[PDB]
Design a protein around this nucleic acid. Structure first.
Ligand SMILES: Cc1cn([C@H]2CC[C@@H](COP(=O)(O)OP(=O)(O)OP(=O)(O)O)O2)c(=O)[nH]c1=O
Ligand SMILES: [Mg+2]
Lengths: 218, 1006, 57, 436, 69, 65, 57
DNA sequence: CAGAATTAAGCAATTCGTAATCATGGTCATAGCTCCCGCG
DNA sequence: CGCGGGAGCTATGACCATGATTACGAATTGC
């Protein structure tokens, strides 16, 4: 649980000891991308760009990866909205509702799940824009997902178009599930039963299956 | 009104449309917006079974449906392959829907749009105007493409517009980052509809002081402060970076036919759009021709996984999200797909492409004046060199030294160049346009106006070099022919590989032959034996070797025996010789030999001993007459190659016919490829089996064949090897040769379709016209049906070190004895890309040495082993001690992919480490230069381990450190093992290899 | 010929011993077979010395 | 041109691929008791999951050591104290232990091969697996050409209710008892012997496996003394028609039972030698040991066939004798009425519609190979050295070219009976032509 | 000879009898040394044949128990 | 000869070979007697008795006292 | 006719032994005398065993 | 209202590097095993 | 006089190191 100084607006960024092998390169990449990144108003606050750097990676066996935060009201934690207005976490909660048989809930949060680290590939985006900070976060996103997939057993990707390159963005073999995004049309995310597939692929790796009922906020 | 299809391009989002980019005769760009809707093919009862009616449905007629599944039958009796003829209707929906038991799902909607509406994507059409509906100026909308695109007028030349560009960026580090490094130059080649090629370079003015800016204004450069002040006619324009980016943006938003870059989607266009988003927040907005939907320039990565091994990601190409119709074309990706070169950096492509032989008229102390014309090299090669010399700056002489162009003269039939070259004794030297031989980061450290104008010249050389590679590879002609043949949009032609480009003419054929292919069970992959390779009879041939090459062997196999998945009657297998004999006789009586061909093939399973594939030749399959279409295209581009005179057009049309040969062998290979829907293991296995029996037949006929008294006789009879045929089987064949020509032929080597026929004559012209007589006599009597061979070459001094590895002098059928031979290397060290240039140079020199001491015959074998190993000893110790040769002639190269069975593969780990440490990100499919590098304090290493750990990827900005050195030992190990593979006295070779490298040398066994 | 009848009784006893070796040798355990192969290498050494004495003298 | 993805991704997340992943997990948990068919299905699902997901936790297997010792604890050769509770005492028989996987095909312990079984007993076993899907495998024993269901190892249901349903289904079960143990009693040889006498089973039982109700894991207990007995001769006695079990007779006269042929060849039993035999008061049990001689397996086959007789051959797990084959053996293998002529045989196969289905479904060669009881691999090896002259799919003349296979005495014996094979082959060929 | 419980007494009897045979072979060798040092003229071709059959029989008895795995 | 150590070592090292050859003669004689051939042992008895009384007088003459 | 000349060579060798012991036996020293005395008792034990072999019949 | 949209040619044969496997040899425990001395 | 304690030699099986063989995959090309 260490902090490394950044020249730009997130001056102190806090990282767990599991994140330590890639922080000397993350600071190098962020000190060149941030001076042009922070001109645009970012959907998460820059003070909370790296609040999932605080999460350990040894206990996590599943990485759930979105490509970016929400275009508005980004809290820095992927797939968290305390107002529960976002359709992506709503459809995630619907899929887990069919999974776990839990119909009564007030929100869903993937950060409180043991063994699941909710990840945004690009750590920020502009207000009202999707994948706008792609060019800023390409190198940092590559390096951080390189680091995550060394520790987690199963990577789940929430984008079919957005994570089509993910076998090139990663180079270490990891269990990669490129799933449909919850906000994708045709209700393809309603149709797929990927969260069981996460547990079965963990059972293939002799890992503890994710109890997805931990994510519900009562 | 008459148009010619420039490009087809589809828009997505909201209402989904297809667009055509077209040009009329007067020069107006005309767009036709079609409705783009999904295409499905179902039976008539299924078409009435959909409760939601389709948006449109028009009848395709009663079309037979063939279940192309391979079931091995131990008994002779086979179920007839399903031939359910039903009336089929084209389901046309604007929204994607899933239909149960829907057929023909392998094809794209765009090919279905082409063929069901009868539109050729490379065609000229008189558009029936009342079907067109005018949206705005230049854009029309055609609801009924069948009736509007009905008149296919022939070709007319159109004013095709272009924009060729490279950019240069300031790297104080090894490689530019977007965020910290500015753009120095953006060089542009604006070829508009009026046809004049405007060559202008935009120069950044924040990289220079106002003393240097006003000096540039005094020297003729134009200084601008806005977009409207910009003049495209001015050769050199000074501007701010933000105005430079706005000029770049407004040029890229122009509706060109082609914006062509080299490595520019990956670097130049991405850098332009990202630096434009950084400095001013603007984006390069591509608008649709109806101005409905507009997208920004976002370079999307596209990855192609491999189809062998673990199916890892093997190639990465970058493209532009365009919807205005401009074919944004990266030449890096195209030449990576097409050419086979050590690296596809632009200066290596300029090494390979614009290589001309130059005579010397004047010699000076520091200036060497080269002349090149139709007498020095091939016709049209000197125009191509002069065309590059119009903007070229540095010319590489004999691929080793790089010389700056002092003064440029463009002749009528060649070039006149003055080069900063040391005085060289020979008169004719190879001239290539490859390297600049500069430290660009060093010129960025001490940037001035003279350095700015020099890199403006180099940047406009690169931008026009995109055009010279465009015309050298003939990419608009290649694009048009690929669009017509593969029935694909012009922007889609090279981007897909074989499997998609088959599907266009395959769909044309399956609608023509009224046939649908379906599969019920899963496709199962088995290993099958390929084409037969014969061991060489001996290593050296003093005596001339005739080369007989089948005209498209595996296509002619598939056409001859009607090898398709759909015409496979079934597969008869036997675990035992008893049911093999029963099935053999009962196979002959059930299936007649003319209409059905039984191919005795290699078993798919270990318990089976025979696997006989039966093909119905009564009705022609879709794979054979698809191959007939592909060899028709190859034959017409081959006869356009024959009528071609200039070397550039000859290279274009030779690449055309080679590409069509490759895609015909891909119609082959998709039957061997499991994940294709044209997969037919029996058809591909029997294709290799018939090709095996044909090369065995042509070998056994040509081996032991003698010519006597003007009569050519063969050792074996001229029987069709699969059945009794109507043609006579008499090996006694009358020639049109003189009586006194008594010469004996024997086969010494055979690789798949190419038998190497050693005639005992050494006369070149005699062997050539005797071999033309042999080619005529085999094509008239020995071969049958579609099978033809061509006498390609006479191989003199054929040095076969192994199978698939030979060096020889080639005399073609058009060439004579007095004509100069072309030294052909096939699979040897000069060909291979994992072999360093120093290795290639000493293999060439020692091949020359061994050839001359074996041709003289004065000198014995043990002592020539002595002196050539002592010469190797002194050369390798001089190279290890002096280290005079640079790093670039010890650079290996390999393709960066992810197709690795091991997670911890050292090559993959090397590229990932270099991608972490260096600002270069080596993409997938990139060919990177790497060398074995060790610290210089390490002495000569006897026993070699951890060789992959000594690999260091070499960049053009990479310089070898003083502490580091080239690991010469393993290069010398490979060189020594090839050299002792060349020559005799193996025990001394073992001792020599053991004393120098602590190891037993690898040795070939014949 | 006392030496000849002594060697004849030796080879008859050893023939009976090798027949019961064939009787027990299918299921001899590893330390068992190691010991009896050690004794058979001692056999080969002893008959090597005996052959040297009958050859050289 | 971005509308065809950066790199197209399959529908991993679809439900059918979840069923493939769950099947991959189920056959991964069943690796040690699956056949080669389910091993190939597991490897197909592994390569699918590796092409589909960029890594999976499981890897491809080239060979699986087929052992069920995770469910079955170490064999106790000494008396012990049994805990209080309810137990299911099941007798372990002498023959080769076979296991019926969830893939509806029978697996051999120690080899993993699929032995080929009669149709009714496979149908009964498949209906047993259709009754209870929680059964991991059905432990079977092949002794004297009989399949006894030893045990039904299942996750949930006790084997006691399995056994009565299998006995109604036609399967062979032991007469087993379930009892309480009142107190900590030394499980000795006397209580073992009266437990064996309580097992009213004529066929030999080598040990007893008891199942706790509290614990799913079960343990085999076995009280014996190792013995090494001199061997008078080796005999075969006929257990089915053309089916002979090997047997070993000692000099004292007591008969050592032999499991299969490959037990006799693996342990290298020779006359006038010593073999490892487990000794009981009731019978003798040959140990499953490897022979320590330097004699190769083919020369053991040489010597065994030379001692027994030249017109005996190895047929899988049982010896088979050759003889003059005719319509009687074909009607016996077809399980149909005895028949005088081939015409009458054609008629009765037409009368019995399922027998006509069996004639249509398998080939002439497989029928004529099974009717004389030839092995699979040995007879394919014999025919794969011979050239045949044939009229009308009938062997008029047979000759052999390569005599390297005649060093195999089973292949030599089957070559001796190849005239009778040709006669039955022409008979079955005429039957297949006249039916169809 | 019949129905012996363990091979350990049987192989111990085998080894002890074979120690006696090694002792007797060394004994006949070292008295052959004495009769050769005596200087009596002897012809030992049949003795060489006897040791040839001895070596063949010892090799036959050895080869069955040489190697594990 | 000085200090008589080499003499004692010499007279010790041969007598073990002597008793080895005596046991060899005994074992060859056992091998003859177990062969079953008819034998007379009179001259051998005379040789062993004169060896025995020469050994006993040597033992009486080698006493330490 | 070989065992008799073998024992005759043994008798001649022990004649050499007894003559050299009688030559050196003017001084013998006590511990080596006790060692050769126990050697001679072992000699007489072996001779008594061989005499039992020649006199058992 | 907050993305999806499938491709993908085969095998033969050589070379080279790496890693598993095996032949050969060196070394070390280890049982035979045999004698020296000794003490009752 | 007879067997136990001790010590030294000596083949002999097991283990380990070194180097040669070979399967095995990548890289490449020929086809
Ligand atoms: C090049 C190539 C060839 N093949 C097969 C198919 C046939 C044989 C011979 O083709 P060849 O190159 O000699 O020339 P060929 O195709 O026979 O045509 P020409 O000899 O040029 O007329 O090899 C293939 O499968 N894949 C390929 O990429
Ligand atoms: Mg060809």
């Amino acid at each position: 649980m260490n902090s490394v100084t950044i020249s730009h607006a997130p001056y102190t960024i806090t990282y767990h000891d599991d994140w330590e092998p890639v922080m000397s390169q993350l600071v190098e990449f962020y000190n060149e991308v941030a001076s042009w990144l922070l001109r645009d108003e970012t959907s998460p606050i820059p003070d909370k760009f790296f609040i999932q750097l605080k999460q350990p990676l040894r206990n996590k066996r599943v990485c759930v990866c979105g490509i970016d935060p929400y275009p508005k009201d980004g809290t820095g934690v992927p797939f968290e909205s305390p107002n529960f207005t976002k359709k992506s976490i709503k459809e995630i909660a619907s899929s887990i509702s069919r999974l776990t048989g839990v119909i009564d809930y007030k929100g869903y949060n993937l950060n409180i799940i043991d063994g699941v680290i909710p990840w945004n590939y690009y750590l920020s985006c502009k207000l009202g824009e999707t994948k706008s900070h792609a060019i800023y976060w390409d190198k940092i996103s590559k390096l951080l997902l390189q680091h995550i997939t060394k520790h987690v057993s199963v990577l789940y990707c929430l984008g079919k178009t957005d994570f089509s390159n993910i076998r090139a963005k990663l180079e270490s073999p990891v269990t990669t599930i490129v799933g449909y995004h919850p906000a994708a049309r045709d209700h393809q995310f309603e149709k797929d039963r990927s969260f069981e597939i996460i547990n079965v692929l963990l059972e293939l790796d002799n890992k503890t299956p994710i109890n997805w009922a931990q994510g519900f906020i009562y | 009104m008459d148009v010619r299809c420039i490009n087809w391009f589809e828009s997505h989002g909201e209402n989904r449309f297809l667009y055509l980019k077209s040009r009329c005769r007067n020069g107006e760009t005309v767009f036709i917006r079609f409705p783009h809707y999904f295409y499905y093919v179902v039976t008539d009862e299924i078409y009435q079974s959909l409760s939601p009616p389709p948006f449109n449905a028009r009848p395709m007629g009663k079309m037979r449906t063939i279940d192309i599944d391979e079931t091995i039958s131990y008994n002779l009796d086979i179920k007839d392959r399903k031939c359910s003829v039903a009336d089929m209707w084209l389901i046309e929906e604007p929204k994607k829907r899933s239909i149960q038991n829907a057929t023909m799902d392998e094809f794209f909607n765009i090919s279905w749009f082409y063929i069901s509406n009868g539109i050729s994507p490379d065609g000229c059409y008189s558009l029936d105007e009342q079907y067109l509906t005018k949206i705005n100026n230049g854009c029309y909308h055609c609801d009924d493409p069948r009736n509007c695109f009905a008149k296919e007028i022939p070709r007319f030349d159109i004013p095709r517009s272009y924009l060729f560009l490279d950019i240069e960026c300031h790297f104080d580090k090894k490689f530019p980052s977007v965020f910290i490094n500015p753009i120095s130059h953006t060089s542009y080649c604006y070829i508009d509809l009026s046809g004049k090629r405007l060559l202008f370079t935009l120069i950044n003015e924040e990289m220079l002081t106002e003393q240097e800016i006003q000096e540039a204004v005094d020297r003729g450069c134009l200084r601008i402060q806005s977009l409207m002040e910009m003049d495209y006619e001015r050769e050199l324009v000074l501007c701010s970076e933000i105005v430079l980016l706005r000029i770049a943006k407004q040029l890229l938003e122009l509706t060109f036919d082609y914006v062509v870059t080299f490595n520019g989607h990956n670097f130049d266009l991405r850098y332009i759009t990202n630096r434009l988003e950084l400095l001013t927040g603007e984006k390069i907005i591509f608008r649709s021709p109806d101005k409905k939907e507009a997208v920004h320039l976002c370079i999307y990565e596209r990855n192609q996984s491999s189809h062998k091994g673990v199916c890892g990601m093997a190639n990465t190409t970058f493209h532009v999200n365009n919807n205005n119709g401009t074919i944004f074309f990266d030449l890096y990706s195209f030449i990576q797909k097409s050419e086979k070169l050590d690296s596809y950096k632009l200066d290596s492509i300029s090494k390979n492409a614009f290589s001309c032989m130059g005579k010397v008229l004047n010699r000076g102390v520091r200036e060497m004046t080269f002349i090149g014309d139709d007498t020095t090299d091939a016709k049209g090669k000197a125009d191509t060199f002069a065309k590059v010399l119009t903007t070229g700056n540095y010319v590489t002489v004999d691929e080793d030294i790089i010389c700056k162009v002092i003064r440029k003269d463009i002749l009528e039939n060649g070039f006149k160049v003055v080069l900063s070259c040391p005085t060289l004794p020979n008169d004719i030297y190879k001239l290539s346009f490859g390297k600049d031989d500069i430290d660009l980061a060093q010129m960025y450290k001490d940037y001035n106006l003279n350095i700015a104008l020099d890199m403006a010249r180099y940047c406009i050389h690169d931008a026009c070099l995109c055009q010279y590679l465009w015309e050298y590879y003939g990419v608009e002609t290649k694009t048009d022919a690929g669009a017509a043949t593969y029935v694909l949009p012009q922007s889609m032609v090279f981007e897909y590989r074989a499997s998609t480009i088959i599907k266009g003419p395959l769909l044309k054929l399956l609608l023509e032959t009224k046939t649908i292919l379906v599969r019920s069970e899963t496709k199962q992959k088995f290993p099958y034996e390929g084409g037969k390779v014969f061991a060489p009879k001996q290593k050296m041939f003093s005596n001339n070797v005739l080369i007989f090459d089948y005209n498209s062997l595996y296509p002619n196999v598939c056409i001859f025996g009607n090898l398709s998945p759909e015409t496979l009657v079934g597969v008869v297998v036997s675990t035992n010789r008893l049911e093999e004999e029963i099935n053999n006789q009962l196979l002959l009586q059930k299936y007649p030999p003319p209409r059905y061909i039984t191919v005795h093939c290699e078993p798919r399973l270990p318990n089976l001993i025979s696997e006989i594939a039966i093909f119905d030749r009564s009705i022609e399959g879709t794979i054979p007459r698809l191959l007939r279409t592909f060899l028709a295209e190859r034959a017409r581009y081959k006869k356009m190659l024959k009528q071609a005179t200039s070397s550039t057009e000859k290279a274009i049309y030779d690449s055309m016919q080679y590409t069509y040969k490759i895609v015909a062998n891909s119609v082959y290979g998709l039957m061997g490829f499991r994940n294709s829907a044209l997969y037919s293991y029996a058809s591909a296995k029997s294709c290799t089996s018939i090709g095996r029996r044909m090369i065995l037949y042509l070998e056994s006929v040509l081996n032991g064949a003698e010519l006597s008294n003007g009569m050519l006789r063969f050792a074996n009879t001229l029987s069709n090897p699969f059945y009794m045929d109507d043609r006579d089987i008499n090996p006694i064949v009358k020639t049109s040769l003189p009586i006194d020509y008594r010469f004996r032929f024997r086969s010494v080597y055979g690789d798949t379709d190419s038998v190497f026929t050693e005639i005992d004559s050494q006369d070149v012209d005699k062997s050539i016209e005797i071999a033309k007589e042999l080619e005529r006599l085999i094509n008239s009597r020995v071969l049958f049906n579609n099978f033809k061979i061509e006498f390609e070459a006479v191989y003199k001094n054929l040095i076969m070190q192994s199978k698939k590895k030979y060096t020889t002098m080639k005399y073609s059928a058009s060439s004579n004895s007095k004509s100069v031979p072309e030294r052909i290397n096939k699979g040897t060290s000069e060909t291979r890309r994992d072999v360093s240039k120093f290795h290639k140079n000493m293999i060439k020199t020692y091949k020359t040495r061994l050839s001359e001491m074996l041709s003289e015959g004065r000198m014995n074998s043990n002592q020539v082993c002595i002196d050539i190993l002592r010469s190797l000893e002194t050369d390798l110790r001089s190279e290890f001690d002096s280290r005079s040769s640079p790093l670039e002639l010890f650079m290996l190269s390999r393709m960066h992919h992810s197709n690795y069975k091991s997670a911890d593969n050292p090559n993959m780990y090397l590229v990932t480490e270099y991608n972490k440490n260096n600002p270069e990100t080596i993409e997938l499919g990139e060919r990177y230069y790497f060398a074995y590098i060790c610290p210089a304090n390490v002495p000569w290493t006897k026993k070699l381990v951890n060789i992959k750990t000594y690999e260091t990827i070499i960049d053009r900005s990479f310089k070898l450190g003083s502490n580091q050195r080239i690991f010469y030992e393993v290069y010398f190990k490979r060189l020594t093992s090839e050299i002792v593979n060349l020559l005799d006295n193996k025990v001394l070779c073992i001792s020599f290899f053991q004393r120098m490298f602590g190891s037993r040398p690898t040795f070939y066994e014949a | 010929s006392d030496l000849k009848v002594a060697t004849d009784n030796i080879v008859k006893d050893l023939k009976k011993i090798i027949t019961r070796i064939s009787a027990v040798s299918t299921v001899l355990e590893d330390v068992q077979a190691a010991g009896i192969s050690r004794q058979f290498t001692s056999m080969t050494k002893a008959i090597t010395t005996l052959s040297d004495l009958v050859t050289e003298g | 041109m971005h509308h065809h993805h950066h790199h197209g991704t399959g529908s991993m997340t679809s439900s059918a691929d979840l069923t493939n992943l769950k099947e991959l997990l189920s056959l991964y948990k069943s690796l040690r008791f699956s056949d080669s068919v389910a091993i190939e299905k597991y490897n197909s699902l592994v390569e699918w999951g590796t092409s589909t997901y960029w890594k999976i936790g499981v890897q491809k297997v080239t060979n699986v050591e087929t052992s069920i010792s995770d469910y079955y604890d170490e064999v106790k050769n000494k008396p012990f104290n049994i805990d209080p509770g309810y137990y299911i005492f099941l007798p372990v028989y002498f023959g080769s232990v076979f296991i019926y996987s969830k893939g509806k095909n029978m697996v051999e312990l120690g080899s993993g091969n699929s032995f080929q079984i009669p149709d009714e007993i496979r149908s009964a076993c498949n209906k047993v697996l259709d009754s209870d899907n929680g059964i991991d495998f059905l432990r079977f024993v092949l002794l004297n050409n009989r399949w006894i269901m030893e045990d039904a190892i299942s996750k949930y249901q006790s084997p006691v209710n399995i056994f009565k349903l299998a006995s109604e289904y036609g399967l062979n079960i032991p007469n087993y008892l379930e009892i309480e143990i009142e107190e900590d009693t030394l499980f000795d040889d006397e209580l073992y012997s009266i437990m064996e006498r309580s097992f009213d089973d004529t066929f030999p039982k080598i040990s007893i496996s008891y199942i706790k109700l509290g614990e799913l894991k079960r343990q085999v207990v076995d009280f014996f003394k190792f013995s090494f007995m001199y061997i008078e001769s080796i005999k075969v006695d006929r257990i089915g028609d053309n089916i002979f079990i090997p047997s070993v007779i000692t000099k004292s006269g007591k008969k050592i039972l032999v499991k299969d042929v490959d037990h006799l060849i693996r342990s290298k039993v020779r006359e006038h030698t010593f073999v490892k035999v487990k000794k009981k008061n009731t019978f003798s049990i040959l140990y499953d040991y490897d022979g320590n001689g330097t004699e190769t397996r083919g020369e053991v086959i040489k010597r065994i066939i030379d001692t027994i007789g030249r017109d005996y051959y190895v047929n899988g797990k049982y010896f088979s004798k050759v003889g003059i084959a005719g319509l009687k053996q074909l009607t016996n293998k077809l399980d149909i009425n005895e028949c005088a002529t081939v015409d009458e045989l054609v008629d009765e196969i037409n009368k019995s519609g399922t027998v006509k289905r069996k004639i249509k479904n398998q080939s002439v060669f497989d029928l004529s190979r099974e009717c004389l009881g030839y092995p699979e691999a040995d007879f394919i090896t014999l025919v794969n050295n011979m050239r045949f002259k044939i009229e009308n799919c009938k062997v008029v003349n047979f000759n052999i070219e390569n005599t390297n296979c005649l060093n195999n005495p089973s292949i030599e014996t089957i070559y001796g009976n190849f005239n009778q094979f040709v006669s039955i082959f022409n008979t079955v060929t005429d039957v297949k032509k006249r039916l169809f």
